[PDB]
RNA sequence: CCGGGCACUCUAACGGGACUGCCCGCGAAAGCGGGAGGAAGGAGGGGACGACGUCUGGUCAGCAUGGCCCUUACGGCCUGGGCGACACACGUGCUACAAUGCCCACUACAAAGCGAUGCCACCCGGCAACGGGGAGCUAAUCGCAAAAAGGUGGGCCCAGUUCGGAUUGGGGUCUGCAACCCGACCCCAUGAAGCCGGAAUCGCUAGUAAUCGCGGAUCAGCCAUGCCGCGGUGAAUACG
RNA sequence: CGCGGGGUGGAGCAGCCUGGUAGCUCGUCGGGCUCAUAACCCGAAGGUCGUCGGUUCAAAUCCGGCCCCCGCAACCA
RNA sequence: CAAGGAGGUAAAAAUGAA
C-alpha cells in the first residue's frame, strides 16, 4: 500500500515493512503502530483497509520523511555553503566530517583507491 | 552485531548500557 | 638545485642556517658540500676527490653518496640538474 | 626542556587538569605508577636493589 | 649477555630486603621518597666510611637506620662529633625518630659493594685495571671466599675503544637459588668518561 | 623429526549410544568449541532418520561411514622436485578421519536450510551410496586408480 | 537469618607425596619397553632462571656520563596551532558477509583483581546516557558485576535481507576553565562496502587451537578494537 | 624534382584492401618472492592513428592537398 | 655371517652493498 512515497513491501510484517521508508527506521516503526493501535506481526498484504488508512494518515503526517526530509538534510549541508565553517569544507573536499584519521581508511567518503605511485 | 550500538550484544562489547541494554531489572 | 630533504637537521642548516641539527665541527664541511650539490648541474660536478662520490647498490639503487667525514655520508638522488631526498646517514 | 619541566610537574597550579604525574627518581613523564611515584624504569632498578619493601619477583 | 640482578633474583629466599616497612597506599609513595632521600643524603657525607648497606626499618614515626661500614672510623666517640648533628640533620625534612645505628662489617674483602668501590677508586687513581682486577679477586679469595668475580667494562685505561676486563676464581654459580651471592657495583668517574665495576662474592648455602 | 610416533588420541563415548565413533562425528560438527550445539544437531538428525526411514540411526550412520571410506588414496612423493604421485593404501585411522570429515563438509554443502536435515539426508544418501561425500570418496579413488603406473615406487 | 557447631567447602602456613624405588623382559652398564602401585608419574603440567660470546645491534629523548656546541640566546614563561594533516603504500588488528545465524524476553553456571581526596546498594525523574537523593564499606562484612557463550520461549526464512554496521543530518548527556580543529557515551533518522577473499602469507600438538565474556595497570575524561592477566565451553591431526 | 611503399600508446609491430571491434611483445605503474637486486608470480594503467580538407548517419580504414621516411628509376647521344 | 675392488650422481636457480 502506497503509504508515504513508497508501496513496495508486501507479505512481510508491518513493523518491518515500515522500515522500508527513509524516515522510519526501527524505533519510529513500532512507535507508529502502537500509537495507531495495529498488530505489528500482521501480513502487510493489504489487510484491513481501515488500519492501513489510519497508519498512512498518522505516519505520512506527524514527522517529516521520504523525499521531503532528504531535501531538508541536503539543505542542512547547504547551510555550510555560503562562507561556512570547517565542517562545510569537509563536505566540500569530500573528506570525513568528524575529524578522524584520513592517512589511511576514510574510503567510505573518499571512495575507492586511486594509487599515485612514486 | 558486536559493533552495532543498538543491541544488547553491541552494548556489551562497547561496555556501556542504555535503552537497548538496561542496567538489569 | 637542492629540491627536497629527508634529514631535518640537513634541511635546517641549508634553509635557515640552523646548525643545531648537525655536529658543531662539521658545520662548515656539510655546508660546502650542500652548496656544491646545489650548484651542481650534473652528477659529474660532484666528483672532487674529497667527496669520494659513488652510487649505492641494492635497494638503494638510484642514490648517490658523498663523504662528509669519517663514517658519515650525505645521500641523495640526482636527476636533471637537481638533487632530491638529502639525507645524513651512517657508513654501516 | 627538562629541568624547567620537572619544575612544573611539582608546581601544579592554574587549572586542575594541567597537573600531571612525573617520576621522582628520574624526570620521566610516561609510564609513571601512582603507587610508587616512579617510572617503570626506576621501579625495576630499585626492585632489583631490594630497596622496595615487599616488592618481589613474580613467578607462577 | 643479559643476566638478572643476583640480588633481586633472591630477595625472598636468601638475601633479605634493605628497607623493611609496611604501609598501604597514600603513604607508600611519600615514605619511599623520604626513604630514598635518606639513602641519598647518607651516601654523600659517609662515603669515606665506605658503607656496605643502609638498612631501614619503620614503625609509625620510628624510622630506624642501620649503616654497615667496614671501618666506622667516622663516628669518633660520642661527643667527638661525626654523629651528633650528623644523625640529627636527617630530621630537617623528617622530624621523626632518627635512630641511626652503626655496624662493623668485619671483613671488607667479603663485602661486594666494598670490593667494587675499592676497585673503582683504583680506576680513578689511574691504576693498571687488569692487574687491579686480578689482585682484588685474589684478595677476596684470600679472605676465605668460596668464589669471586670482578668485571670492569668500557674505556679501559682511557684509549678510544670500549673494552671489558674479566677475572674470576673459584666458584660463582649465578643460576642457583641457594647461593648467598653478594653483588656490588660502582661508578668510576674519569676525565675520559665513566666505567662500571661489578663484583660478585660467593659463599656456600644449602 | 617425529622421534615419538605420536600415540592415537582416545575419546569419551557418547550418551545413549556408546559408539567410539559418534563422538568423533559430533566433534567435526562442533565449531568454536560448542559441543552442546554439535551433539544436539546430530541427535536431532537421528530423530530425522526415524521419519524418512524406519531404520535405527546407529546403523544408518555406521553404514554411511563405511561407504565413504577411501580404500586407496594418491600420495605425492620423491625424485624430480616431488613430481610423482604414488597411489598409497589408506590406514584404518585415516579412512576413519576422512569419512567423518567428508560427511560433515558435504553435509554443509547441501542446499537445505537446517543443519540437522543436512546431516540426516547426507547420511541417508551415503548409507545408500549416493551422497556428495561418496562422490568425494569415489573421486579420490579415481586419482589413485589413474596412477598405477609408478605405483611400484610404493614405499 | 538466629541458636549452636565448625566435621565438609573455602581461606593461607608449615608438611607429607615417587626417587621408574616394586614386577616381567632387554642390556656390560647407563637406560629403554611393558605391568598391577596410587590423585599423580621414567624431567606430572605450566612459570622464574638466558653460558663464553656474536651482531662497531638497541638506547646521549628514563637516567648517568667524556667531548663538541648554545648562552639577552639552541634557555625561560604564555595564548593559540601542530603531533589527529591525506592522491596514495605496507604492518598489526577489530567488526563482518549470516540460519551449527540474527533480534527480544526469561532464566542459570566463574575465576582473577580494584575501591571510603572512591566503589557507590536501594529508591526517585528520565525512552536512555545520566541527574536528584541516599544506606553500607578503612572492605574473605559493603560496592563494582548481571559474567557471556549456555538453557527455555517466541519471532524473522534466506533476499544485501530483522545479515552487515560504515558514513551522514538532527537531538541530548558527562568529565573538564574549555572538548572547532580533536573526547567518550546516549537517543531518532540514514543505513555504505562487503554474499568469504589474487600472487602470496601466519598461528597452534591438550585445557592446547577455536570461541565466550570478566578484571587491572595508565587514567579528570578518553579516541583501548591495545597491552598485562582471569576463568567459561572446548576440537582436529601427527604416516612419516 | 619521376614512379612505388610507409608515418598507429614510451620502443618495435599488427588492424586499413571486405568503414561501426584499435590488438601483440617489451617497457612503465602497483603488489608479491629474497637479507637485497635480477629472474619469476599477481594486478593494473597508457594511443590527437603525421597534418589540412573532403565523402559518409559514421573515417585508423574511403578520396584529395601539402609534411617528413624508405626503396627503385634518371637511359641513346 | 664380515666387504674389498667395480658404475650410474645434483636441479633450472645469476649476482653483491659501498
Ligand atoms: Mg636451570
Ligand atoms: Mg651503530
Ligand atoms: Mg643526556
Ligand atoms: Mg603520533
Ligand atoms: Mg555490492
Ligand atoms: Mg547470502
Ligand atoms: Mg610443541
Ligand atoms: Mg613492479
Ligand atoms: Mg626483484
Ligand atoms: Mg642502349
Ligand atoms: Mg652484474
Ligand atoms: Zn624515572
Provide a concise account of the structure shown.
Chain E: This is Small ribosomal subunit protein uS3. Chain E: InterPro entries: KH_dom (IPR004087), KH_dom-like_a/b (IPR015946), KH_dom_type_2 (IPR004044), KH_sf_prok-type (IPR009019), Ribosomal_S3_C_sf (IPR036419), Ribosomal_uS3_bac-typ (IPR005704), Ribosomal_uS3_C (IPR001351), Ribosomal_uS3_CS (IPR018280). This is part of a larger assembly, with chains A (118 residues), B (25 residues), C (92 residues), D (60 residues), E (206 residues) and F (155 residues). Chain A contains six helices and no strands.
Structure description:
- Chain C: Its EC number is 3.1.-.-.
- The structure is cut from a larger assembly and holds chains A (118 residues), B (25 residues), C (92 residues), D (60 residues), E (206 residues) and F (155 residues).
- By secondary structure, chain B is mostly helical.
- Chain B is 28% helix and 0% strand.
- Chain B is built from one helix and no strands.
- Chain E has three helices and eight strands; from the N terminus they run E-H-E-E-E-H-H-E-E-E-E.
- Chain F has 155 residues and is mostly helical.
- In chain F, 54% of the residues lie in helices and 6% in strands.
- Chain F contains six helices and two strands, in the order H-H-H-E-E-H-H-H.
- In chain F, helix 1 packs across helix 2, helix 2 packs across helix 5 and helix 3 packs across helix 5.
- The longest helix of chain F is centred in the N-terminal third of the chain and has 18 residues.
- The chains are: A mainly alpha (118), B mainly alpha (25), C alpha+beta (92), D mainly alpha (60), E alpha/beta (206), F mainly alpha (155).
- Chains in contact: D-E.
- Chains D and E meet through helix 2 of D and strand 1 and helix 1 of E.
- Bound molecules: magnesium ion (11 copies) and zinc ion.
- Zinc ion (ZN) binds next to strand 2 and helix 2 of chain D.
- The site of zinc ion has 8 residues of chain D, from strand 2 and helix 2.
Amino acid at each position: 500500500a502506497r503509504i508515504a512515497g513508497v508501496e513496495i513491501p508486501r507479505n512481510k510484517r508491518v513493523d518491518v515493512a515500515l522500515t522500508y521508508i527513509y524516515g522510519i527506521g526501527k524505533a519510529r516503526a513500532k512507535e507508529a503502530l502502537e500509537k495507531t493501535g495495529i498488530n505489528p506481526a500482521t501480513r502487510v498484504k493489504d489487510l484491513t483497509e481501515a488500519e492501513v488508512v489510519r497508519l498512512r494518515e498518522y505516519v505520512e503526517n506527524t514527522w517529516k520523511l521520504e523525499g521531503e526530509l532528504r531535501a531538508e538534510v541536503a539543505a542542512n549541508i547547504k547551510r555550510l555553503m555560503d562562507i561556512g565553517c570547517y565542517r562545510g569544507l569537509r563536505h566540500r573536499r569530500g573528506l570525513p566530517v568528524r575529524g578522524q584519521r584520513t592517512r589511511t581508511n576514510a574510503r567510505t567518503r573518499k571512495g575507492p583507491r586511486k594509487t599515485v605511485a612514486g | 552485531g558486536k559493533g552495532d550500538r543498538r543491541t544488547r550484544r553491541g552494548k556489551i562489547w562497547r561496555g556501556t548500557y542504555g535503552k537497548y541494554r538496561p542496567r538489569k531489572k | 638545485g637542492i629540491k627536497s630533504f629527508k634529514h631535518k637537521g640537513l634541511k635546517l642548516l641549508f634553509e635557515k642556517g640552523v646548525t643545531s641539527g648537525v655536529p658543531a665541527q662539521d658545520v662548515d664541511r656539510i655546508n660546502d658540500r650542500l652548496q656544491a650539490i646545489d650548484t651542481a648541474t650534473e652528477i659529474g660536478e660532484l666528483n672532487r676527490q674529497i667527496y669520494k662520490l659513488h652510487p649505492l647498490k641494492g635497494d638503494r639503487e638510484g642514490y648517490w653518496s658523498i663523504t662528509v667525514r669519517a663514517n658519515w655520508r650525505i645521500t641523495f638522488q640526482f636527476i636533471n640538474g637537481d638533487a632530491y631526498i638529502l639525507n645524513y646517514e651512517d657508513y654501516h | 626542556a627538562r629541568k624547567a619541566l620537572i619544575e612544573k610537574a611539582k608546581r601544579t597550579p592554574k587549572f586542575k587538569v594541567r597537573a600531571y604525574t612525573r617520576c621522582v627518581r628520574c624526570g620521566r613523564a610516561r609510564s609513571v605508577y601512582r603507587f610508587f611515584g616512579l617510572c617503570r624504569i626506576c621501579l625495576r632498578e630499585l626492585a632489583h636493589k631490594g630497596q622496595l619493601p615487599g616488592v618481589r619477583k613474580a613467578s607462577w | 649477555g643479559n643476566k638478572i640482578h643476583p640480588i633481586g633474583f633472591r630477595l625472598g629466599i636468601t638475601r633479605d630486603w634493605e628497607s623493611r616497612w609496611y604501609a598501604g597506599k597514600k603513604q607508600y609513595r611519600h615514605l619511599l621518597l623520604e626513604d630514598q632521600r635518606i639513602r641519598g643524603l647518607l651516601e654523600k657525607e659517609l662515603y669515606s666510611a665506605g658503607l656496605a648497606r643502609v638498612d631501614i626499618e619503620r614503625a609509625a614515626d620510628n624510622v630506624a637506620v642501620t649503616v654497615h661500614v667496614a671501618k666506622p672510623g667516622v663516628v669518633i666517640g660520642r661527643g667527638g662529633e661525626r654523629i651528633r648533628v650528623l644523625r640529627e640533620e636527617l630530621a630537617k625534612l623528617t622530624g621523626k625518630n632518627v635512630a641511626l645505628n652503626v655496624q662493623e662489617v668485619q671483613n671488607p674483602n667479603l663485602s661486594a659493594p666494598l670490593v667494587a668501590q675499592r676497585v673503582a677508586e683504583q680506576i680513578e687513581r689511574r691504576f693498571a685495571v687488569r692487574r687491579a682486577i686480578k689482585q682484588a679477586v685474589q684478595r677476596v679469595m684470600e679472605s676465605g671466599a668460596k668464589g669471586a668475580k670482578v668485571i670492569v667494562s668500557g674505556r679501559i685505561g682511557g684509549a678510544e675503544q670500549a673494552r671489558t676486563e674479566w677475572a674470576a676464581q673459584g666458584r660463582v654459580p649465578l643460576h642457583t637459588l641457594r647461593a648467598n651471592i653478594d653483588y656490588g657495583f660502582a661508578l668510576a668517574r674519569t676525565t675520559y668518561g665513566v666505567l662500571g665495576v661489578k663484583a660478585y662474592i660467593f659463599l656456600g648455602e644449602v | 623429526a617425529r622421534r615419538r610416533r605420536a600415540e592415537v588420541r582416545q575419546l569419551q563415548p557418547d550418551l545413549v549410544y556408546g559408539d567410539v565413533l559418534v563422538t568423533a562425528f559430533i566433534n567435526k560438527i562442533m565449531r568454536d568449541g560448542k559441543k552442546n550445539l554439535a551433539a544436539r544437531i546430530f541427535y536431532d538428525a537421528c530423530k530425522i532418520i526415524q521419519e524418512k526411514t524406519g531404520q535405527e540411526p546407529l546403523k544408518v550412520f555406521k553404514q554411511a561411514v563405511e561407504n565413504v571410506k577411501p580404500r586407496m588414496e594418491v600420495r605425492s612423493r620423491r625424485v624430480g622436485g616431488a613430481n610423482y604421485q604414488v597411489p598409497m593404501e589408506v590406514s584404518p585411522r585415516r579412512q576413519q578421519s576422512l569419512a567423518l570429515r567428508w560427511l560433515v563438509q558435504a553435509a554443509n554443502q547441501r542446499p537445505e536450510r537446517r543443519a540437522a536435515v543436512r546431516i540426516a539426508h547426507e547420511l541417508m544418501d551415503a548409507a545408500e551410496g549416493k551422497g556428495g561425500a561418496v562422490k568425494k570418496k569415489e573421486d579420490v579413488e579415481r586419482m589413485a586408480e589413474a596412477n598405477r603406473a609408478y605405483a611400484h615406487y610404493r614405499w
